[PDB]
Amino acid sequence: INLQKAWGAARRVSKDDWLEWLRRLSLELLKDSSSPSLRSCWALAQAYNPMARDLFNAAFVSCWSELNEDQQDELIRSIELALTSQDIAEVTQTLLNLAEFMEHSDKGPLPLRDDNGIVLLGERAAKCRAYAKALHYKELEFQKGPTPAILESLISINNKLQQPEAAAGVLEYAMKHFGELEIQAT
Amino acid sequence: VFLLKGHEDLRQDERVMQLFGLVNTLLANDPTSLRKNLSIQRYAVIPLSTNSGLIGWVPHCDTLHALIRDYREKKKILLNIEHRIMLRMAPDYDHLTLMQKVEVFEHAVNNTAGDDLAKLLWLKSPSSEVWFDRRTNYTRSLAVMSMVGYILGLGDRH
Amino acid sequence: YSTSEMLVNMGNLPLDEFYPAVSMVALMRIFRDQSLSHHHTMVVQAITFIFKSLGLKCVQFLPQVMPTFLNVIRVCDGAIREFLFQQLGMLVSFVKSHIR
Amino acid sequence: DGNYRITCHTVMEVLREHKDSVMAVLEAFVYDPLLNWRLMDALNKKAIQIINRVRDKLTGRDFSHDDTLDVPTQVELLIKQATSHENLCQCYIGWCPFW
Amino acid sequence: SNTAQRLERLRKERQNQIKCKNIQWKERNSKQSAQELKSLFEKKSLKEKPPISGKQSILSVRL
Amino acid sequence: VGSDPVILATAGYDHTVRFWQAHSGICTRTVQHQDSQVNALEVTPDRSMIAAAGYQHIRMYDLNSNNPNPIISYDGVNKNIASVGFHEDGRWMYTGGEDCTARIWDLRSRNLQCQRIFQVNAPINCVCLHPNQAELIVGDQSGAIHIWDLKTDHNEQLIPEPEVSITSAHIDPDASYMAAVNSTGNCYVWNLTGGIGDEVTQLIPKTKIPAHTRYALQCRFSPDSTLLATCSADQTCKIWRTSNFSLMTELSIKSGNPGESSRGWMWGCAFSGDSQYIVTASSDNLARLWCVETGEIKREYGGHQKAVVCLAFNDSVLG
Amino acid sequence: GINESTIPKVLQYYSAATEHDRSWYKAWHAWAVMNFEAVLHYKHQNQALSKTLLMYTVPAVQGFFRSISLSRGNNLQDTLRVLTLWFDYGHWPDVNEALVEGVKAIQIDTWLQVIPQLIARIDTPRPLVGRLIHQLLTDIGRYHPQAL
């Protein structure tokens, strides 16, 4: 219930402030997680920051389930703002791992703008130099409807993933399972 | 750990293990094949008589049939949904002509989306980096046995 | 790889006992290194609370804590060793017959 | 058509380049008097055609004896046969063709 | 008794089992009647060269 | 009761064959057919007995009386029966089996031994009879059409293209063309024998009509030899003319909704005496009555519970 | 193709290649395999003389043994083709002298890969070829008793 103050600050502009905001958010979650097991580690979190980073995923899911639709909705738009604000790899990596943890859970991925925000996360991880995650999101978009933009994007990712043969298969897909005289020369 | 087999002739299996050993050597000294890390997994076969033997136990491996069965039962999905649909549309499936079986078979695969193995391999991957590495090995290891098995003429690959 | 498995909950463990599992591995990570010797005083006071809070469901965590906990007492020196014995005396009072 | 087909092309080229090496081991296998009984269902006449079939499959003269097929064309024909619905439906039920 | 009931029970289905005519395929033919085959199954009724028109009377009474 | 000028019969996976009439949609009689599925059924020229063949037995049923049992049954074959047929005078019955044997059965209960056996290397799917009752056509799964002549014991082997299995073949009653279809939808038409005297059995390739992109199931002519209807697996039936082989009328049963996804194939078709109304039996557990001009259906029959893959429709010769 | 005149021609080229540059694996192997292919061509010819296959079998055996000692690690094909001639044309006295010197010349640690083939034909009914198998099997047990 008090996570909104930790989330909704909007006063973070410098890189250090984002780092301070991340540790304040991580510290807040351990304080009230509706589980005595996580509360006991709150004291060590203040005296040791690295032990609180790996507990961010466990703390977040505990509080997120308790909140109702209205409370959890405000968190979602705060996460969207955090993702589309800075370009620091460290901050994005923490949020990227949170999304993957929710997908493996049986409750499904956390809601976002469009289809759990696969489009937003897909282009966000490209600049973070984590192409394993980026390829996964692009394939999810392809399963719904193939488009020339997606086919071009898949070729680029595989080329920088040291898989020249995998990118070759994408071209053959457009040669026969797509309109002719449409493949760009690039 | 071994697997003591009875009432089975393992002399033939010993001879095909030697054949796979030759294929591994052939792919080892090929510059275009060595770089892709192509190989065939083998297990020890020690025959003891004309109808007995001793097969080595390969760890960390589970059969495909049991792998799919666990996934479907967890998702509250019947193990033989596809088989039931074919029988529902035509109970005498085993007696239909060649053209009629195609209609029943094609109808079953269209009403059920086959992606159990695709999602199974991802839910067992701790991260996305590991998931991509395992998928690449799976694709290029199934292709090797398909061509080698074709030359050897392997059958009954249930 | 087992530690990495628990961080993502690959076993689909229910959240009721998932939190003690993920908390335990995090504490042991900063407990196996002699560099963080100053934090060893208070981390044990948190481990003993987890065992007390759970009760009979902390048995499966014994194979993780005990091998490291006994090793630390052997190598640590000073007033910490006298404090660890009292804490070790509280852990054996929670799990009774499984310390065999 | 990506990793799978390209890998199949690479493996087939290796086998055809070393045809003699893999033919010698198979010949010592089929021509074993005490081991070919299960494949016997003249006396060695059937063993002759088995080796002939293997040699044809290693030269591309398998689908049609009239012409010789290259690796890309031979692999393409195998893929069509393996995934064709006409061949899959005839399989045994326990084989799970639909899976 | 036990088998007495079965004996009369078996007769009940015997009455209804004689209502079907079964013709088996014997492996016999006119193999030696090569010359006689020109008329046994080789009638060759080449006829009906003249065509006849119709007035759609087949469906006239149907609808 | 078969004491009507026109009769209609449908059968399929429902294990029961329904007898219909063109005047109304009511079902006259229901006959039972256990532990088998009907491949194709045809009525004897005497119009007093019908034949149903499927899975190693050809059960014969009565029409004048009301007997739901197979009064006459045939056995001996070890595989399915592709199709059956009768001589114009009802002397002998020719049956095509999946066991690669095309044989002729004798309808006389005496030691006539008028049966002949023809052997091929591949299982057959369709058997056709020449209008003069002197020649016969055998088509296997290898795409090779064997023209079998009854006068002699040699059969010419003709194959338009290999690797493709043919499904149906038919000859118009007026003996003007000879068409057949294969597993890719191509409908090959050859000019039939012009040697009516000594049966020189010569053939030439007349035309090829590219249509039916999906599987082609059955092609059949019309009594007036002016129409040609070919079934297909894409739920569409196209009627072709004998003048220039153009699309005369196109028939379809697709609902236009992507959520169905080929709900049922279109198996068989049949013409009437005047070649005006056609009867079609699809695998959607129902049969429809169509018209060659308006396109829109005339009547619908939905008394079956399972799919129907065969139908028989004959009427009076005059029309 | 391999004809009655092509085979004598190609043997001249391969024979000259061996002497020009010895200790070449692809040189001895190509000449040795051709002789093995030559006898098979003549064997199929006369089944549809003992002294007509002798001029090709003897050089083939000598050629394979040279290649075996020259590969030392990838000679599975070479060590297997020897058994084919040994078990089928080893009953003639002229072939025995080439085989006995070859076995002694080559290293003992080369027959391990072909142990299953040797055990299969222990019971050959020809005493001239049967006893030759026993000597090397005993020699294998002398050095590697736990493999046999």
Cα-based angle A35, A38, A44 (whole degrees, multiple of 5):
150
Chains in contact with A, where contact requires at least 3 CB pairs less than 8 Å apart? B, C, D
Residue pair F143/F165 in contact (Cβ under 8 Å)? The answer is yes
Q: How far is it, in rounded angstroms, from Cα F149 to Cα D14? A: 53
Question: Which residue is associated with the tokens 């709150």?
Answer: A42
| B near G: at least 3 beta-carbon pairs less than 8 Å apart | yes
Counting one residue from chain D and one from chain G, the pairs whose CB atoms sit within 8 A come to 18
Q: How far is it, in rounded angstroms, from Cα F273 to Cα F313? A: 10
| A near B: at least 3 beta-carbon pairs less than 8 Å apart | yes
Residue pair F85/F129 in contact (Cβ under 8 Å)? The answer is yes
The reply to whether F306 touches chain B by the CB within 8 Å rule is: yes
Continuous H helices in A84-163: 89-104, 118-124, 131-144, 148-159
Q: How far is it, in rounded angstroms, from Cα D59 to Cα D79? A: 18
Inter-chain touch B14–G116, beta carbons under 8 Å = yes
Nearest CB among B92, B99, B103 relative to F36 is that of B92
Q: Which two tokens stand for residue F102?
A: 């095309």
The reply to whether C68 touches chain A by the CB within 8 Å rule is: no
Is B71 annotated for ligand binding? Answer: no
Cα-based angle F171, F176, F178 (whole degrees, multiple of 5):
40
Is B119 annotated for ligand binding? Answer: no
The reply to whether B123 touches chain A by the CB within 8 Å rule is: yes
F126, F132, F135, F136 alpha-carbon torsion, rounded to 10°: 10
Counting one residue from chain E and one from chain F, the pairs whose CB atoms sit within 8 A come to 103
The reply to whether B15 touches chain G by the CB within 8 Å rule is: yes
Nearest CA distance, B117 vs chain D (angstrom): 10
Largest Cα–Cα distance of chain E, in whole Å?
A: 75
Question: Which residue is associated with the tokens 């076995």?
Answer: G103
* Interface test mutation site (partner B, options C6, C8, C9, max chain B beta carbons within 10 A): C8
Residue pair F230/F212 in contact (Cβ under 8 Å)? The answer is yes
Per-residue CA distances from F28 to A154, F12, F67, F125 (Å): 63, 17, 13, 31
Q: Which of F16, F113, F28, F13 is nearest to F70 (CA)?
A: F16
Is B3 annotated for ligand binding? Answer: yes
Per-residue CA distances from G117 to B49, F174, G87 (Å): 16, 72, 11
Residue pair F6/F315 in contact (Cβ under 8 Å)? The answer is yes
State the number of CA atoms in the 13 A half-sphere of A58 facing the CB.
Answer: 32
Inter-chain touch A41–C27, beta carbons under 8 Å = yes
Measured between CA atoms, the residue of chain G closest to residue D23 is: G77
Is B43 annotated for ligand binding? Answer: yes
Q: Which two tokens stand for residue G98?
A: 């080439």
F30: β partners: F18
Q: How far is it, in rounded angstroms, from Cα A98 to Cα A116? A: 13
Residue pair F262/F289 in contact (Cβ under 8 Å)? The answer is no
Count structural domains, chain F.
1
| B near E: at least 3 beta-carbon pairs less than 8 Å apart | no
| C near E: at least 3 beta-carbon pairs less than 8 Å apart | no
The SS3 call for residue G3 is coil
Q: What residue numbers bound the domain in which F139 lies?
A: 4-316
Resolution (A): 3.4
Q: How many CB atoms lie within 10 A of CB C50?
A: 21
- Chain B residues within 8 A of G76 when measuring between CB atoms: 22, 25
D90: CB partners within 8 A, 6+ apart:
B98, B101
Residue pair F212/F234 in contact (Cβ under 8 Å)? The answer is yes
Helices G76-89 & D19-30 angle (0-180, nearest 10): 40
F42: β partners: F51
Q: How many CB atoms lie within 10 A of CB B55?
A: 17
State the number of CA atoms in the 13 A half-sphere of F107 facing the CB.
Answer: 18
Inter-chain touch B68–D22, beta carbons under 8 Å = no
* Interface test mutation site (partner D, options A142, A165, A173, max chain D beta carbons within 10 A): A165
Q: Which two tokens stand for residue F39?
A: 């491949």
Nearest CA distance, G109 vs chain D (angstrom): 19
Residue pair A86/A18 in contact (Cβ under 8 Å)? The answer is yes
Task: Provide long-range contacts, Cβ within 8 A and 24+ apart, for E29-35.
Answer: E29/F113, E29/F115, E29/F116, E29/F117, E30/F113, E30/F114
Q: How far is it, in rounded angstroms, from Cα F145 to Cα F127? A: 10
State the DSSP H helix or E strand holding residue D38, giving kind and residue range, or none if neither: none
Residue F95, amino acid = T
Q: Which of B137, B147, B158, B115 is nearest to B37 (CA)?
A: B137
Q: How many CB atoms lie within 10 A of CB F300?
A: 10
What is the distance of C-alpha E9 from the center of its chain? 32
Nearest CB among F74, F274, F298 relative to E58 is that of F274
The reply to whether C42 touches chain B by the CB within 8 Å rule is: no
Inter-chain touch G74–B29, beta carbons under 8 Å = yes
Question: Which residue is associated with the tokens 């600050």?
Answer: A9
Nearest CA distance, C58 vs chain A (angstrom): 12
The reply to whether C26 touches chain A by the CB within 8 Å rule is: yes
Task: Give φ, ψ of F307 to 5 degrees.
Answer: -70, 150
Measured between CA atoms, the residue of chain F closest to residue B95 is: F55
Task: Provide long-range contacts, Cβ within 8 A and 24+ apart, for F84-89.
Answer: F84/F40, F84/F41, F84/F42, F84/F51, F84/F53, F84/F58, F85/F42, F85/F127, F85/F129, F86/F42, F86/F44, F86/F45, F86/F51, F87/F45, F87/F129, F87/F133, F88/E45, F88/F45, F88/F133, F89/F45
* Interface test mutation site (partner B, options D4, D6, D10, max chain B beta carbons within 10 A): D10
State the number of CA atoms in the 13 A half-sphere of F150 facing the CB.
Answer: 25
Q: Which of F215, F181, A177 is nearest to B105 (CA)?
A: F215
Helices B81-89 & B98-111 angle (0-180, nearest 10): 130
Q: How far is it, in rounded angstroms, from Cα F237 to Cα F231? A: 5
Residue pair F244/F252 in contact (Cβ under 8 Å)? The answer is no
| DSSP tag of A134 | H
Is B58 annotated for ligand binding? Answer: yes
Q: How far is it, in rounded angstroms, from Cα F35 to Cα F296? A: 37
Residue pair B120/B77 in contact (Cβ under 8 Å)? The answer is no
Range C58-95 burial, b when 16+ CB lie within 10 A, else e: beebeebbeeebeebeeeeeeeeeeebeeebeebeebb
Number of helices (H) and strands (E) in chain G: give both, helices first.
7, 0
Inter-chain touch F37–B98, beta carbons under 8 Å = no
Inter-chain touch B124–C10, beta carbons under 8 Å = yes
Q: Are strands F81-86 and F72-74 parallel, antiparallel or unpaired?
A: unpaired
Per-residue CA distances from D85 to B143, D90, E38, F188 (Å): 20, 9, 45, 24
Counting one residue from chain B and one from chain G, the pairs whose CB atoms sit within 8 A come to 8
Nearest CA distance, B9 vs chain C (angstrom): 39
- Chain A residues within 8 A of B132 when measuring between CB atoms: 132, 135-136, 161
Chains in contact with B, where contact requires at least 3 CB pairs less than 8 Å apart? A, C, D, F, G
Q: Which two tokens stand for residue A172?
A: 């053959």
Inter-chain touch B151–D90, beta carbons under 8 Å = no
Range A13-46 burial, b when 16+ CB lie within 10 A, else e: eeeeebeebbeebbbbbbebbebebbbbbbebbe
Q: How far is it, in rounded angstroms, from Cα F287 to Cα F290? A: 10
Nearest CA distance, A163 vs chain B (angstrom): 9
Q: What sign has the CA pseudo-torsion A174, A179, A183, A184?
A: negative
Q: How far is it, in rounded angstroms, from Cα G115 to Cα A149? A: 60
Inter-chain touch B92–F309, beta carbons under 8 Å = no
Q: How far is it, in rounded angstroms, from Cα E18 to Cα B35? A: 76
| DSSP tag of F69 | S
